[PDB]
Design a protein around this ligand. Structure first.
Ligand SMILES: O=C(O)[C@H](O)[C@@H](O)[C@H](O)[C@H](O)COP(=O)(O)O
Ligand SMILES: [Zn+2]
Length: 260
């Protein structure tokens, strides 16, 4: 059934060290002929620290050595220089140093600060990204018969207290996109989550085809979420329970609390 790897870390500087260690280890295990490996980045302070660690400790591996091709697993429909942009964050801590031919943020260039984006806009950005992905990454039939989705080597994920991952929110349509017909979907945050802006996100089908999925999550308030992914039988399941269906390697980098 479901056996992900789980490791617990007392501090942020410890989990960030393991997150970055885990990526490097996947990078080395793959060897240079496989590079660049594709990785879908997540937003949030935990990954942020992991990025800064790669920036400080393995720039050479990524720049001179071109180990990874960076993508965004989910994004806020705001301008790229907005502080609410996942890319903005990623770029501030790491990507301003990564070759441009190895960085692929979402195209939010039509999003201005005068008019909030709608689902119409998010859908446009998603379709376009889906196209780039199919052109850049390997495609794989879903269920050996089904439609074609791109295969990432690595997807970094976060988890919210509403049990969502990436920008795939409870009750959402994105959440239902598991058959492969939709590679990048759309979604609006639930009540307890901010910023209140439309999102684009890798669908669950795309994520379940990734070769490695690494979830970093802290907080006692997110424990129900992990508990709910790991349970034998689904009961009042969080959205993230779909991760159970991941075809590749799943790992949880957890703090002491969310673990307990
Ligand atoms: O390390 C963090 O800060 C979390 O991983 C963080 O991302 C949060 O708990 C939710 O993910 C809400 O952000 P969203 O509403 O955009 O998903
Ligand atoms: Zn730098």
């Amino acid at each position: 059934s479901f056996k992900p790897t789980i490791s617990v870390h007392a501090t942020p500087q410890e989990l960030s060290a393991a997150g970055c260690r885990k990526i490097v280890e996947i990078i080395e295990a793959s060897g240079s002929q496989q590079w660049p490996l594709s990785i879908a980045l997540a937003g949030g302070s935990t990954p942020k620290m992991t990025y800064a660690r790669l920036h400080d400790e393995h720039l050479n591996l990524l720049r001179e050595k071109r180990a990874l091709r960076f993508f965004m697993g989910d994004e806020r429909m705001v301008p790229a220089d907005s502080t609410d942009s996942n890319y903005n964050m990623a770029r501030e801590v790491l990507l301003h140093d990564i070759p441009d031919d190895l960085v692929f943020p979402f195209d939010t260039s039509a999003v201005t600060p005068s008019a909030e984006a709608t689902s119409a806009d998010a859908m446009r950005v998603a379709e376009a990204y889906g196209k780039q992905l199919a052109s850049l990454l390997p495609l794989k039939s879903v269920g050996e018969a089904g439609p074609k989705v791109p295969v990432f080597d690595v997807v970094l994920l976060g988890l919210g207290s509403d049990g969502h991952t990436a920008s795939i929110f409870p009750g959402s349509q994105a959440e239902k996109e598991t058959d492969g017909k939709v590679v990048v979907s759309v979604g609006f945050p639930s009540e307890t989550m901010k910023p209140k802006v439309w999102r684009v996100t890798l669908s669950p089908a795309t994520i379940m085809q990734a070769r490695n999925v690494i979830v970093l999550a802290t907080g006692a308030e997110k424990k129900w979420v992990v508990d709910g992914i790991l349970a034998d039988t689904a009961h009042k399941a969080p959205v993230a329970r779909f991760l159970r269906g991941c075809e590749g390697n799943v790992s949880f980098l957890l703090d002491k609390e969310i673990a307990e």
